[PDB]
Design an enzyme around this catalytic site. Structure first.
Site, PDB file in Angstrom:
ATOM      1  N   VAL A 116      15.673   8.630  10.202  1.00 53.33           N
ATOM      2  CA  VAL A 116      14.560   9.535  10.397  1.00 53.33           C
ATOM      3  C   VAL A 116      14.037   9.998   9.011  1.00 53.33           C
ATOM      4  CG1 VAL A 116      13.699  11.635  11.401  1.00 53.33           C
ATOM      5  CG2 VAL A 116      15.356  10.186  12.683  1.00 53.33           C
TER       6      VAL A 116
ATOM      7  N   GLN B  27      21.048  14.704  11.360  1.00 55.32           N
ATOM      8  CA  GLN B  27      21.300  14.215   9.998  1.00 55.32           C
ATOM      9  C   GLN B  27      20.970  12.706   9.807  1.00 55.32           C
ATOM     10  OE1 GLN B  27      21.730  15.666   7.232  1.00 55.32           O
ATOM     11  NE2 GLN B  27      21.626  17.723   8.270  1.00 55.32           N
ATOM     12  N   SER B  28      20.124  12.099  10.695  1.00 49.64           N
ATOM     13  CA  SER B  28      19.848  10.722  10.544  1.00 49.64           C
ATOM     14  C   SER B  28      19.208  10.329   9.193  1.00 49.64           C
ATOM     15  CB  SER B  28      18.819  10.314  11.704  1.00 49.64           C
ATOM     16  OG  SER B  28      18.248   9.035  11.404  1.00 49.64           O
ATOM     17  N   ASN B  29      19.777   9.306   8.538  1.00 53.09           N
ATOM     18  CA  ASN B  29      19.115   8.736   7.351  1.00 53.09           C
ATOM     19  C   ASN B  29      17.877   7.949   7.691  1.00 53.09           C
ATOM     20  OD1 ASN B  29      21.303   9.390   5.476  1.00 53.09           O
ATOM     21  ND2 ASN B  29      22.459   8.000   6.786  1.00 53.09           N
TER      22      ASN B  29
ATOM     23  N   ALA C 242      19.995  11.386  15.203  1.00 53.81           N
ATOM     24  CA  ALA C 242      20.693  12.668  15.074  1.00 53.81           C
ATOM     25  C   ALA C 242      19.923  13.563  14.093  1.00 53.81           C
ATOM     26  CB  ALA C 242      22.038  12.411  14.509  1.00 53.81           C
TER      27      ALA C 242
END
Ligand SMILES: Cc1ncc(COP(=O)(O)O)c(CN)c1O
Ligand SMILES: Cc1ncc(COP(=O)(O)O)c(CN)c1O
Lengths: 328, 328
Positions: A81, A77-79, A75
């Site tokens: 990534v 807001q992925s942590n 997403a």
């Protein structure tokens, strides 16, 4: 050890010392149960989290293949990534992120602040997609483009949750076992269960190191029906690569994530407020707040195997607090 | 040996193990000089920072005097208020924060996101004022009103920077001496210099442990003429408390904070971008971006005593990135 095969895998050193395992006296007094927390949110790169433990293995593999580029997905807001992009920057590798917006929001802090802001600070190349309908296939297609632009890409799956990346959570289980020998009667462990590497790695390690403990995965995106086969397959794949037996059942609670991945809920947000105000600990709206809401309801409904101490795995995520505010 | 009187002050345990001291190879390659970083941004409570080191001593002192409420002051986006509020929440102390808006912004992320948002999670009682014109007087007036409710307040000054809070950074200097022993011969140390407890505590500790190292404070708020007497008064008061003398000259560079406290500048921004993109390290627009822009320019203009290795003290601050975005 029975886990000595872990030492065969090349791994980079991103973490160093074992993260803290702490008693939560105020939370425990409030809930009337002994609660401990494994602080994997304090891993030292770019605001931390559980994926740095996976990237130790994944990025060593990328360097062994002589890659110059890491490619992953999540997403906006992925942590995961975020952590991948920070490690790429640290090592002077390019990073390409395939992102989707899983919740159809146009809120500016979700679109541009929190983890997404950090991606820009790390010079991540951003590729938007309408939906991650088949992430492995989409990442592969993308990697082949990028390779044809002159780069040498290495693909990290969603969450970094391959068996290799999950070895990071076999490592976390060794630390947990070392740190709990001074914890009379640990009964249960609670962790968010999404792309499943954390859950599956813990499952393989704790079966061998702490066989009396019950590991509960609180799902963040799927039903027990949809999630269980995923965690079992990974459990078996990790144990195969470690030449270990893995017969423990996988336990999952799916009551805590509605209405979907990436959407905050009230019990989630109340757990974030409870942990911050009683212990000064920061959880997150997507993963750990929902997992903690689950732990709390487990107490309320007597859902655990017995009333003994519970260890919560803090996997991170707190930068998303700033993206989800004030609403999505 | 000479810092032994330090063991006489009660202190709580917030930090635990020494924080990492890491080489920055990619930044070292770009700048043409060996750069190491002391990672006090990874201290393990609520997003970390330099103030947890001072709060170990200050809050021990509050507890010994039977105080049950911490009262302090800063800007809406203060990291110090945020750290104080988190330690208060962790220990079941009440916390009251006197806040100002130093830059006159109406931008919503500055008013309500970042550190500000964390304070609401930690149930901080917020007291707004128009300006911190006399913070010690203003805190005392607040403390009188709070004591009238039956609370037992302990006033912590701006930044925690009394001689007792500073002892946290005398302790830091012991860690750094140990970490560099037989590993690197440091020439210089760079740290942001604001309320000056960090600068002064390092000054005292380093003079006694590593007397040939040049310590440079980069101001964040004041000229050399206005800031130097503050650092010297602390330095001398800390030395007094430890039964030591401190004859070193305080060194300060004031070229890197214009147009003022809490106002981002281009060189600050560029230093934040350089550190994220080269090392996956997050600095901040108020304090560390400016101190690192000073380090960079110091190298460019040969401002340091020689060409030898420089240790940057990373004092934290990153939650402000989310409050300053997209602008103020
Ligand atoms: C903070 C946080 N916690 C838990 C998880 C879930 O971990 P897993 O993907 O291993 O199921 C993630 C996934 N990115 C996460 O970011
Ligand atoms: C991130 C950061 N770095 C540096 C400083 C300046 O430290 P001092 O107040 O000890 O001068 C502060 C002050 N709160 C800070 O928040």
């Amino acid at each position: 050890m029975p886990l000595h095969h872990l030492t065969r895998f090349p791994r980079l050193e991103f973490i160093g010392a074992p993260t803290p395992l702490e008693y939560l006296p105020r939370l425990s007094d409030y809930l009337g149960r002994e609660i401990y927390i494994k602080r994997d949110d304090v891993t030292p790169i770019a605001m931390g989290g559980n994926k740095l433990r996976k990237l130790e293995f994944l990025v060593a593999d990328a360097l062994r293949e002589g890659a110059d580029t890491l490619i992953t997905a999540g997403a906006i807001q992925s942590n995961h990534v975020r952590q991948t992009a920070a490690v790429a920057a640290k090592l002077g590798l390019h990073c390409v992120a395939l992102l989707e917006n899983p919740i159809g929001t146009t809120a500016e802090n979700y679109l541009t602040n929190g983890n997404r802001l950090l991606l820009d600070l790390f010079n991540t190349q951003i590729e938007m997609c309408d939906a991650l309908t088949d992430p492995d296939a989409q990442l592969q297609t993308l990697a082949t483009r990028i390779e044809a632009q002159g780069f040498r890409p290495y693909v990290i799956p969603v969450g970094g949750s391959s068996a290799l990346g999950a070895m990071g959570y076999v490592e976390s289980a060794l630390e947990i076992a070392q740190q709990c020998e001074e914890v009379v009667g640990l009964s249960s462990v609670v962790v968010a269960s999404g792309s499943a590497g954390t859950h599956a790695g813990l499952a393989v390690g704790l079966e061998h190191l702490m066989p009396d403990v019950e590991l509960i995965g609180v799902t963040v995106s799927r039903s027990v029906a949809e999630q269980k086969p995923k965690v079992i397959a990974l459990q078996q794949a990790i144990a195969g690569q470690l030449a270990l037996t893995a017969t423990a059942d996988i336990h999952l609670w799916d009551d805590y994530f509605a209405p979907g991945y990436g959407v905050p809920n009230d019990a989630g947000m109340e757990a974030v407020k409870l942990l911050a105000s009683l212990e000064g600990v920061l959880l997150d709206p997507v993963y750990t707040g929902k997992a903690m809401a689950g732990l709390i309801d487990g107490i309320s409904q007597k859902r655990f195997n017995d009333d003994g101490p519970i260890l919560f795995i803090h996997t991170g995520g707190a930068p998303a607090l700033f993206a989800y505010h004030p609403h999505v």
